[PDB]
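forwarding from the other thread:

> can someone predict this with chloride ion?

sure thing
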Amino acid sequence: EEKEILWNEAKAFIAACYQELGKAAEVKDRLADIKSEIDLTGSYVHTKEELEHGAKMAWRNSNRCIGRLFWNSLNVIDRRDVRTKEEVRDALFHHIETATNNGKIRPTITIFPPEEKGEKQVEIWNHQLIRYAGYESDGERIGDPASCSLTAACEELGWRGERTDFDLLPLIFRMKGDEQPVWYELPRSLVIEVPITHPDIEAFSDLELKWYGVPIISDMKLEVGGIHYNAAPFNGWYMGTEIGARNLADEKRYDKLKKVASVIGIAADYNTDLWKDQALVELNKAVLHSYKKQGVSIVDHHTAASQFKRFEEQAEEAGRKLTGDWTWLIPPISPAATHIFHRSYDNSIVKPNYFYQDKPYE
Amino acid sequence: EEKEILWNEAKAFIAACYQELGKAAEVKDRLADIKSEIDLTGSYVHTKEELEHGAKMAWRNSNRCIGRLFWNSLNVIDRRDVRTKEEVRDALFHHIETATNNGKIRPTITIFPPEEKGEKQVEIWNHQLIRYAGYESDGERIGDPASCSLTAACEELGWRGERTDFDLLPLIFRMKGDEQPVWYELPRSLVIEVPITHPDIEAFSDLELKWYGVPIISDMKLEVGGIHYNAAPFNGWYMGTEIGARNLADEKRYDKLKKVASVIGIAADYNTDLWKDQALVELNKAVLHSYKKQGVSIVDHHTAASQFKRFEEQAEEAGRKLTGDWTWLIPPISPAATHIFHRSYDNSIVKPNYFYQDKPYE
Ligand code: HEM
Ligand code: HEM
Ligand SMILES: Cc1cc(N)nc(CCc2cccc([C@H](N)Cc3cc(C)cc(N)n3)c2)c1
Ligand SMILES: Cc1cc(N)nc(CCc2cccc([C@H](N)Cc3cc(C)cc(N)n3)c2)c1
Ligand SMILES: C[C@H](O)[C@H](O)[C@H]1CNc2nc(N)[nH]c(=O)c2N1
Ligand SMILES: C[C@H](O)[C@H](O)[C@H]1CNc2nc(N)[nH]c(=O)c2N1
Ligand SMILES: [Cl-]
Ligand SMILES: [Cl-]
C-alpha cells in the first residue's frame, strides 16, 4: 500500500506544479523518472523547482491562514543537505537572521531532509524557533504557560532559565540515531524584541510587556507530493491581534487585561462597562504602535483582511477553487468589521499543505 | 409518505416530552389517540402542555442561541383559536405589551393555528414585529437597508412612511383566503424606544441614535412533533452587541462607525489606529448604558456567555446532548474573551426547533 500512496500523490502534485510553471510537456518524462525511482529506492527526490513551488502551494492551501496573498513570494531555503547537528543549528540560526532582516521581515521556510520510512532525520522540539519559557510550581506562575511542558523538558536536559517572564527557550532538536536531543542557547543578537508602549498613555510602559519580532513555526510537517518534510520551519510577520488579543490577553497565556485596565485608567469591576473590550483595543493599539516604531514588520487585522480579499479575488481570476477555515480566518477582535465574517469558506484539505504533528515530549 | 412523516415525528416528540414531564406512562395511550386522529383528519392537535413544552424544547435546541439558559421560563401564549385578522392583530398587539412589560422584558411566544396541508392559516410578513423601514432611491439612503424590500411591499399596499431613519413599519400579515395582506400602524404607546447616549461623552447624543426595546422574531416556523406553526412570533431581550456591533455598525445597516469616531474624538484615517475597534467598544458601551438607564432589559456579551456556560453545564447534568453553532454563538466583539471561542460545538439539528422560511414578498 505505502508505495502506491506515494506514487498517487506524486502524479497529482507534479502535474499540478508543472502546469502552473508552464512545463506541462515535461510531466510525462518526469513522472517516468519518478516511477522508476520509487520502484528502486522506495521514494523519490524533488527538484529544487518542485520543492520551492510545493512550499508555496502549501502556504496557499493553508485554510487557517489570512496572510496568503503573498504565497508566491515565499523565500525557500533548500537545506536537504545537512547531516550534522552543528549544521542544523547553524541553518536555524541563519533562518532567524535572514527572515528577520533587521525588522523588514521576509517570509521564509528552511527545508530539512524528509522522513524516510516515516523515520525522521531531524526532529525539532520547538513549537516556534523563538519562544518564551513558562514555569508553574507552588502556585507560582512565571512566563508563558503555553510553554510549560517544553520548558520542563529542556530543564531535564540540563538547561536552566532565569525565570523572568520572558526567558528565551533554547533551540532543542534530536537527530536520527541520538536517543536524546541537543539544545543551544539562542544568541541575543539574533533575536529582535519589541517593548510594548502606547501611543499616548505613558503609564503603559509600567507593565513592562514585550514580544519577539518574528513568529517562526517549527512543529508542522510540510507534505509535498507524498514526501513528508517533518522539519520545515517557516515564518511570516505577526498580525497585531495574535500578540494583543491572544498571547498577552488570554487567561491561559499572559493574562494582562486587568493590568491593562488599570494603566489605561478604567475600572475592571462591571461586565456592562466592557472593560475587557476596551483594554483589548488599547493593548492592540499598543502592539501595533510599538512594532511600527521599532521598524519591525507587522500587519493590523483590517489591512490583513483587505489583503485576504485580494487573495480570494486572485484565486477566482486564476480559476483556482478557494479553501479556508472561517473559524481561524476571522480575527479575535472586531471580526464583524471584516468581509471575512460575512461570507463562508470551503474547509477542504488540498495538498501540498502544512499539517500539525505529535510532539515527542508529552 | 406525508402521513408517515407526521406519525414518526409525533412518536419521537411525545415520548421525549412526556419523559421530561414525568408522564412516561401516559405515552402509550396518547400515541394511540394521536394515531387514530391522524388516521382520521390527516393531522393531530397538541394538548396545551405538549404545546408549551414543545415551544420550550424548541428554544433549547436553537443552536445559534446564546441565551438558552432560560429556556424553561418561556411564557407561551396559546392563540390557536384566532380566525379573524382583527384577532391576529390584537394578539400581536398584546404580545408586544405583555412581553415588553414596561421594560422588564418577558421571553414570550404567541402561537397561531398551524399549517394544515402545508397551507398557512396565518402568514406574517414582518421579519420582526417591531422594525424600522428603509428607503433607497436616487442614491438617497434612509433608514434600515435590511428592511428595504418589505418597506416597498408595504408601500405597494398603500402605507406611507415619514422617511425618517426610524419609521416603525406597520404590522403586515395575510389570512388564508385573502389574496392580499392587511397592514396596521403600530400604536406608539405599545413600543418602547431607547435614545442612545454615552455614560460620559456628552456629544454622543448629537448622533441622535435610538433602537427599539424588544426584538420579536416573526419569520420563523416552530416545528413541534410534525406540526408546523409557521406563525409563532417569539422574543427575548437584546444582547448589547446585536444593536451596537451589528445593527448600527454594519456597512449594510446603519453604518455609524465613522460618525461615532467623530463624536468620541478620534481619527478615522488609519487602520493601525484601530479606530473602528475603538468606536465599536464606545458605541456598545453606549447601548448598554442607555438601556440600563431607561429600565429596559438587556444583557452584555460577557454575562450572556457566562449564562450560556451554565446552560452547557446544566445539559450535562441532565444527560442531554448539547448542540450549537459556534459561528453564531461567538459575539462579534471580543469573542476570544468568552469561553465559547475556545471550545467547539456539535451543530446537529434536534427537534422541536425553529426554522427559517421563505418570505412571500421577493
Ligand atoms: C507574511 C505574513 C503572514 C501573516 C500576517 C499570517 C497570518 C496568520 C495568522 C493570523 C494565523 C493564525 C495564527 C493563530 O491564530 O495562531 C496564521 C496561521 C497560519 N499561517 Fe499564516 N501568516 C503569514 C505568513 C505565513 C507563512 C509564510 C506560512 C507558511 C508558509 C503560513 C502558514 C500558516 C499556517 C499553516 C497557519 C496555521 C497554523 C496552525 O494550524 O496552527 N503563514 N497565519
Ligand atoms: C432572553 C434573552 C435572549 C437572548 C439574550 C438571546 C440571544 C440571542 C442572540 C444574540 C442571537 C443571535 C442573533 C443574531 O445574531 O442575529 C440569538 C439567536 C436566536 N435566538 Fe435567542 N436570545 C434570547 C431569547 C430567545 C428566545 C425566547 C428564543 C425563542 C424561543 C430564541 C431563539 C433564538 C433563535 C431561533 C435564534 C436564531 C435566529 C436565526 O437563525 O436567525 N432566543 N439569540
Ligand atoms: C506563519 C505564521 C505567521 C503568523 N503571523 N502567525 C503564525 C501563528 C501560527 C500559530 C502560532 C501559535 C499557535 C498555533 C497553533 N495554535 C498551534 C497548534 C496546536 C495544535 C494542537 C494544532 C494546530 N493546528 N496548531 C499557531 C504563523
Ligand atoms: C429571540 C431573539 C433574542 C435576541 N436577543 N435576538 C434575536 C435576533 C434574531 C435575529 C435578528 C435579526 C436577524 C436574524 C437573522 N439574520 C435573520 C435570518 C435570515 C436568514 C436568511 C436565515 C436565518 N436563519 N435568519 C436573526 C432573537
Ligand atoms: C455566513 C457567515 O457565517 C455569517 O456572517 C454569520 C456569521 N455568524 C453570525 N453570528 C450572528 N450572531 N449573527 C449573524 O448574522 C452571523 N452571520
Ligand atoms: C476550538 C475553537 O475552534 C478554537 O478556539 C479556535 C477558534 N479559532 C481560532 N482562530 C485563531 N486564529 N487561533 C486559534 O487558536 C483559534 N482557536
Ligand atoms: Cl504566536
Ligand atoms: Cl435585531
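Residues A 327-328; B 341-344 surround 5,6,7,8-tetrahydrobiopterin (ligand 6) (CB under 6 Å). thats all i got for now
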